């Protein structure tokens, strides 16, 4: 990596910050949920009535480090707006997803994947169906939360998101993940008749 | 002043001081030979003129006076530090 | 701070500067878990010992001071600091409370109009960092500052009983069993809401 | 630095409390082809006053300059503190500051030769440089000997006098100066000059 | 160098484009916009390439600001600054008399079953059909002969860059 | 340190901030060599010599070593530069020294050698390595043998020994204690703690071959008949 | 901002404090898009409830300020700031056009003489030039300052129809229609060219 | 970043502890007691897990604090952040209401000589025995409820995570 | 990790300096014991009578680099009070048993531990031989120190510091590595009945 | 090296890639936009690099409104030895013992076989690139520059003069 | 540091001999020379090695400054830094009484077509016949002889490089230079 653009990254990042305006880095771990919740917990600072904008584009992550960003957008008292640009994993269409009801802006050429939370088992014979119960455990919780947020049963979101299911916001307006979509009106074009 | 002629009496505006070295130099051997860069050089007033521009000083030729850490210039004449102090950097007198 | 060799002992400070000693280091309040050094919120709370051209103060009174107030030295044997008339609050009375002083210059004691319980209990909070707005009810008011024009000293507008806002960070902050008390400047008043 | 003027007016008026001045002679654009070096297009610029401003507003009170249009201000080119407004007819008019004026010269409209004769006006006094050695007893610095020639009023006293209270030297007593401490000057007779401010003046030798 | 010239916004497209070198793009896109959007925003395009749904997160973000876009475009750009070199208005679309211009499709991938590779197989194919709706929209070309330059690799010249439709104006005439 | 070494540093001031740790004990005339003395370091040390020489000719420098060996000419342009200067260089040897740091602390002037009570001192011959052909072998041996007479009349100038008593030590692998190497005439002052007189066992290996203890009187010293 | 409790039901400034209220938030003025982060060009001027020891500053007047003036705080459910009569710009008319905004402080408003593209459409090795010359023009002229000698309010010799050869960056700027107005120092005019 | 915060009171245990992971908590926990040992501590815990060795220094000098300690969960304690957990003042230890905690033995390896392996496993039934008497503790739990739980993975809510002692009170509501 | 740790990192030690506390962290290496060295001697210069209370947490080292560390604390003017937070090593407890008597003082869940130094040898005949005496010289001298701090015999401590051995607090008590415990008073915790 | 930020002198050093030739081309977008008259000295030294990264360099310097001087320092090997001809008539500087290397760029062929032929026509298409603008910047024929860009040949800063390369020396 | 020589007009050539490290030396001679053109410039060179296109431009940066300079060997000096040991002003040529000497010939790497080895073989022999026809002219020896010593890969003392023509004096005083 080029240490030059770290700087020049920082930079826009903080000026953005002031503008409160937070972001996802790449893959959801444990280094940048500590981060993430930081910036989250100090932009109520300036006020506490007027929206969060939130930058979402994460290509994958683990499941723990997302749940410790989850729970804290809905407990603070601004709402905080999701804004999906690029491409949202199974982990990062579900932050997109745990904002206000309403406020919930996207563009129309997003990518959005929701598939079951990936994950690994190692030890002993006992070791390996304690560690497969906590993952259906973050199985029920993830298509649980998405129920309830998209407004769907319970049978439709676990089998649309067994395997990876990719949308468009035109198609996932009608779902529930994206409640409206951001595009300025064009000019009426002079078709062929 | 102090180098060309004799007469080392200066004008009305400022005095001059001779700080007293001690002896820290011989235990740099084992620890740092110097105190790090302070204030309260405790110096004596070689010559003193009271009436300025500004405040006046109400010392007498031989005392101690305390100073401030900048607008001052450092000059070896003989030997010895001469620090060309100001008459509104001074504070007061020690014991 | 610097040893000086004790020669005539005749201190006279020039202008309006006032050498005045640090009295004890809290009586080791705080004794016996580490005996660490921590932040002063009591600044040379001790006697002065030469006055110089300064009339506000007396000897021997007991005056707090600033955290920033002057330049330490190590003369008599102990810590002192030699100070200027600009940062001086107010004596102390016989007993050590803090809401009891008056100021004797171009300050202002305010105790902080606030609630008594805001963490409710270690609820999930943040941001409390506020800059603009804070509270502060008045308990005693000074004299105002020396005006260039008429040669005289005037009291500012303002009452000994009402709330009046102020601005943070301003000041030096006490504490007395729990109560705030801010001291701040004349000169730092904005409304009173009373 | 170089802005152009519009073209229906020709009449600049100073920056409030400042001085507006005028120079073309002795340029880069000069009948003089053998010259000195370079301190010779640093020489007394002698720039005509062409009108003065107000006094300084400050913080609510009117200050004097203490001048006349019936000068000829010199100030410091190199010294790029300044505008530089070009009229349309050739003329450029500069305007400077109370601190960028030198002093006046006495037949000014000539060469660096009445130099010795520069008689200041602002917080600046004239020292002549006596031909010595420079650093014997350093290895730090040491500062050059220096005679002075003429001596100028200071800045404006803020006390109810009003008055301008000018600098405590005097023409003939020995003093020092370092080579970065001032303006530098030559002549062509070999003898050297600087100028001082006065809060670079410390003390006599 | 580059902090020299961002706050006259500045945009330079330099290296890979990654998932973190194009979320640097995109950061600094939002910031541009929100302080004046009366006032243009020039693209610098010099890349040799990069990644399918990261070199989509520029296009759609200098589609989000409401002011104006100029891109320009150095040396090489291979299928995502190419792509991004038409992405902005007509009148304003300058190129290097001897910039490459290389047309390309992009790539995929897929690794687990072999029914998560059917799923990546139409993922692509949303792609390919998602880019030859945009790219005729600005060449003024049918989608039969944009499908069929998309195939196969060609690096084209300027000369006719300008008569494609990519492009509008030639720095320097020549 | 592991994983990473954190900046151990302090600038403190009531209106600005001063330097880092290195920077400000090299401005009050404390030179410290750490690491592997290659051709990186040795003109930092020797470009710091030139630096503290312009500041003041008469202030004695001080060159704080602790390395635990170097480059065999590297060492050696660090000496003949602190020898061809005007004023005094006092030595503090810190750690380990193998046979190179241990040079540049008998390199010093006489009685400003000053060694502390657990520092270690060797002194070898130089090491080196044959390369290809004869014509390079033979100038391989013609380069240690050169390397082995210049630091042969080093030790005979700073220490005044013989030269039979250098060529009996360097021959294998020595390892000086430095109440050994007062002996030797290495350094001049042994540095100790407040009243600290412990025997290291190397002096009681001395005391063994001069015949002041027995195993039957072993006295207030450690146990060496362990072997 | 804070919530205030219902204490006092009372506001007295003291000094150079003037409270001001603000208009709306945003007014919904960007409808049609909704634009959840748009420009805010217009730091909420608003009518004036109290007045303090103001000297230049009239109860009916709509003062405009800056976004740093004072601190913020929630009157009963409205927002509010207690601006600095230091940094004030100017009071608005009846009209909302900002060419009737006449200053009452130490500013000077400008139309502005600029180009509107630097750059030409856009080219190449270009968008810099020096911050400070560039071209205006005055339109109205404020109020002066303070004279020592005569106790009365003097303005500089200035009108309302020359041409200025300002300094850039100083201030604030605001669009009427396309045409723009600047505010500067009194104390920024280089030449009054009429 | 984290220094606005720090200021404030709020220290922050996130990443796996190592041996210079967990000296950069501890010597933050002297520096809040250095500032004022009157006013709240809240540390917030975010880790995967860790040694013993380390992380048995973040409890004795969370345990020399004299102030009131005040423990909260953000997301995942495997092991090592659920006994810092409830190591916290009674009454202040909270957590979120969808977070995980799994409580562990702590982890060791020894290798070696075959004597290295009698000082080894004595260690390992010495750390065994001394965090057994500290989680029976605030949790008013006998000893043979504890070491029955804690001999392989488990996971658990923080539904019966308030009845066991970890927590004292839910934040999030229900 | 990232460097925005190290930052905050490097402000709370430089807070340390203010307080006359030094920090001896991570492996005892040549690099780190000249950045600790320096670091003595300048806290001497301020006040040449105020204790200095060094922070011991080091789980290892060479031998060498730690005989620097040992001998500069003895030879100052003021005392240095050491203490142990989390664990000590051979090169660790060296530094911990290095302190003046009766101001050593230890946490009473940290552990102590120690044993004699490792290594190696590697060459010819000779250089195994001459090796082995460096190592020896090594075991003879830190048992000969650590018979005059805890104040036993020279042949109790070999028996001991021959094989890897930890010790409890409540025990180093009754040993002689710490003279006492710092703690706070425990609460009143009522028994069973 | 900012020192030479300020007195209008940027560095061509190792090997021309894409993230040097982007910074390359920032500093000479700042520095003709705080002067347009006064020249840019360049101290071009490299051993080569890729086909288009030395032509995003040079085609910036013919949009540079005053002209440019161009210093060889060390050695140019077929990549810095074209930044060097496309400089201004009257200010191609060379040492005196340098070095200018002429010769074909390098560059792969990595894909199918269809896709290696229609890749090598752009080569082919760079040689002629290449070859028909160093034939105007030399004066010299068409021929003879195709004739010695297919081997390595280097070139004596005395015999550059006379062949084209630069215009004079610096020797001093 | 190297700042505090920076001001005095002194430089360091330390290290092995690099492209980036190249025009570091370059760039900063020739701002000495804008400064001052009267003040001599002293430089330090202790390096082991390094390339002959780089070590060239040090040698061309030198005859570009129309001040004096002076060297100064401390360390090594392996086949590049004797070469630019010599190339300075006579008589103001200084070095330490033990430092060492390397004069042989650079090394280089040939590979690829049947035309390219033979252009890179003549090549470094070009090299070797401008680098032995440079050394001789400051050093006062015949071409003949210069050209069979740098043959031979063998160190040279100080003390018969000051008869062989390299360097003019010796720190010291001659008496302190060790066989």
């Known amino acids: 990596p080029n240490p030059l653009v770290i700087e020049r990254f920082q930079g826009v990042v903080s000026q953005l910050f002031q503008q409160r305006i937070v972001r996802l880095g790449g893959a959801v771990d444990d280094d940048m949920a500590n981060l993430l919740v930081a910036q989250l917990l100090y932009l109520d600072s300036v006020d506490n009535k007027r929206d969060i904008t939130m930058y979402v584009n994460s290509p994958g992550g683990s499941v723990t480090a997302g749940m410790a960003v989850f729970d804290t957008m809905r407990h603070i008292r601004p709402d905080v707006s999701t804004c999906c640009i690029g491409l949202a994993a199974s982990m990062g269409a579900f932050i997109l997803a745990s904002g206000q009801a309403g406020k919930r802006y996207s563009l129309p050429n997003s990518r959005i994947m929701i598939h079951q939370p990936l994950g690994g088992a190692q030890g002993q014979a006992t070791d390996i169906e304690i560690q497969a119960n906590e993952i259906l455990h973050h199985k029920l919780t993830l298509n649980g939360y998405l129920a309830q947020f998209t407004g769907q049963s319970m049978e439709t979101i676990t089998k649309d998101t067994d395997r990876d299911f990719f949308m468009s916001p035109q198609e996932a307006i009608e779902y529930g993940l994206v409640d409206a979509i951001i595009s300025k009106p064009q000019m009426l074009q002079s078709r062929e008749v | 002043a102090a180098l060309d002629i004799t007469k080392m009496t200066p004008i009305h505006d400022r005095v001059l001081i001779r700080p007293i070295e001690e002896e820290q130099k011989t235990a740099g051997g084992i620890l740092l030979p110097k105190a790090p860069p302070k204030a309260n050089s405790d110096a004596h007033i070689g010559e003193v003129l009271a009436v300025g521009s500004d405040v006046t000083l109400a010392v007498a030729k031989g005392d101690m ?29 020690l014991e | 701070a610097t040893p000086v060799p004790k020669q005539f002992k005749a201190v006279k400070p020039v202008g309006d500067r006032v050498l005045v000693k ?114 502060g009810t008045v308990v005693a008011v000074g004299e105002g500052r020396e005006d260039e024009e008429t040669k005289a000293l005037v ?32 000169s730092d008043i904005l409304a009173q809401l009373s | ?12 008026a100073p920056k409030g409390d400042r001085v507006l001045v005028k120079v073309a002679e002795e340029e880069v654009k000069t009948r003089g082809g053998i010259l000195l070096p370079p301190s010779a297009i640093k020489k007394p610029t002698s720039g005509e006053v062409v009108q003065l401003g107000d006094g300084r507003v400050g913080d609510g009170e009117v200050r004097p300059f203490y001048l006349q249009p019936g000068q000829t201000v010199v100030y410091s080119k190199f010294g790029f503190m300044y505008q530089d407004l070009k009229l349309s007819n050739g003329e450029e008019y500069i305007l400077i500051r109370e601190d960028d004026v030198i002093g006046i010269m006495p037949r000014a409209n000539a060469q660096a030769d009445d130099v010795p004769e520069l008689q200041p006006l602002a917080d600046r006094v004239l020292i002549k440089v006596e031909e010595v050695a420079d650093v014997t007893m350093g290895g730090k610095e040491r500062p050059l000997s220096g005679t002075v ?57 | 160098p580059f902090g020299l010239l961002l706050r006259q916004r500045i945009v330079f497209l330099g290296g890979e484009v990654e998932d973190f070198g194009a979320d640097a793009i995109i950061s600094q896109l939002l910031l ?39 891109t320009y475009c150095f040396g090489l750009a291979a299928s995502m600054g190419a792509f991004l070199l038409g992405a902005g208005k007509r009148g304003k679309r300058n190129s290097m008399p001897n910039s490459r211009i290389m047309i390309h499709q992009p790539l995929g991938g897929a690794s687990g079953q072999a029914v998560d590779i059917e799923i990546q197989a139409k993922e692509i194919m949303y792609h390919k059909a998602n880019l030859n709706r945009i790219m005729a929209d600005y060449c003024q070309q049918p989608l039969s002969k944009i499908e069929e330059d998309t195939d196969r690799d060609r690096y084209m010249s300027p000369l006719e860059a300008k008569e494609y439709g990519l492009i509008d104006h030639i720095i320097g005439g020549e | 340190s592991p994983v990473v070494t954190p900046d151990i540093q302090i600038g403190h001031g009531e209106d600005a901030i001063e330097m880092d740790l290195y920077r400000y004990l ?24 030139m630096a503290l020489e312009a500041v003041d000719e008469n202030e004695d420098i001080r060159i704080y070593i602790n390395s635990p060996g170097g480059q065999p000419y590297s060492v050696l342009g660090v000496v003949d530069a602190m020898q061809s200067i005007k004023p005094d260089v006092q030595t503090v040897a810190l750690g380990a020294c193998y046979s190179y740091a241990s040079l540049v602390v008998a390199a010093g002037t006489k009685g400003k050698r000053y060694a502390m009570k657990n520092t270690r001192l060797m002194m070898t011959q130089p090491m080196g390595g044959s390369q290809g052909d004869i014509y390079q072998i033979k100038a391989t041996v013609e380069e240690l043998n050169a390397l082995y007479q210049i630091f042969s009349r080093y030790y005979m100038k700073f220490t005044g020994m013989n030269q039979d008593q250098i060529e009996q030590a360097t021959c294998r692998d020595h390892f000086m204690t430095p109440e050994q190497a ?10 100790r703690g407040k009243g600290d007189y412990t025997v290291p066992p190397a002096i009681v290996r001395q005391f063994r071959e001069v015949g002041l203890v027995d195993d039957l009187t072993p006295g207030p010293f450690l146990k060496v008949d362990c072997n």
């Open chain 2, 65 to 93: 006076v305390v100073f401030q850490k900048y607008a001052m210039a450092e000059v070896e004449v003989k030997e010895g530090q001469i620090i060309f102090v100001a008459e509104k950097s001074i504070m007061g007198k």
């Open chain 3, 22 to 135: 640090v009295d004890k280091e809290e009586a080791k309040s705080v004794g016996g878990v580490l005996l660490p050094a921590s932040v002063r919120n009591k600044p040379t709370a001790g006697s002065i010992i030469a006055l110089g051209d300064a009339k506000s103060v007396k000897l021997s009174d007991k005056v707090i001071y600033s955290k920033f107030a002057g330049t330490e030295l190590e003369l008599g044997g102990a810590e002192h600091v030699l100070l200027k008339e600009e940062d001086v609050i107010g004596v102390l009375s016989a007993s050590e409370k803090i809401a009891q002083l008056k100021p004797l210059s171009d300050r202002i004691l305010i105790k902080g109009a606030k609630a008594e319980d805001k963490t409710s209990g270690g609820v999930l909070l943040a941001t409390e960092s506020a800059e603009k707005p804070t509270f």
């Open chain 3, 155 to 186: 009291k500012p507008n303002v009452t000994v009983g009402a709330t009046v806002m102020y601005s943070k960070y301003s000041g030096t902050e006490f504490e007395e069993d729990g109560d705030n008390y801010i001291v701040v400047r004349e």
């Open chain 4, 1 to 12: 630095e170089a802005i152009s003027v519009p073209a229906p007016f020709t009449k600049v």
């Open chain 4, 149 to 205: 020639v003429r001596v100028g009023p200071g800045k404006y006293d803020k006390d109810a006098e009003g008055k301008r209270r000018t600098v405590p030297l005097a023409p003939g007593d020995k003093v020092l100066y370092f080579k970065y401490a001032g303006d530098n000057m030559e002549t062509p007779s070999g003898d050297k000059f600087v100028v001082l401010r006065s809060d670079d003046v410390l003390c006599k030798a």
């Open chain 5, 32 to 70: 541009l916009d929100s302080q004046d959007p009366t006032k243009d925003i020039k693209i610098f395009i010099n890349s040799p390439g990069g990644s399918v749904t990261a070199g989509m997160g520029i296009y759609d973000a200098m589609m989000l600001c409401r002011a104006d876009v100029n």
């Open chain 6, 26 to 49: 090299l401005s009050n005339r404390i030179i410290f060599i750490g690491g592997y003395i290659n051709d990186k370091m040795a003109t930092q040390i020797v470009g710091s010599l």
């Open chain 6, 182 to 191: 007062k002996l030797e005439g290495l350094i001049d002052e042994i540095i």
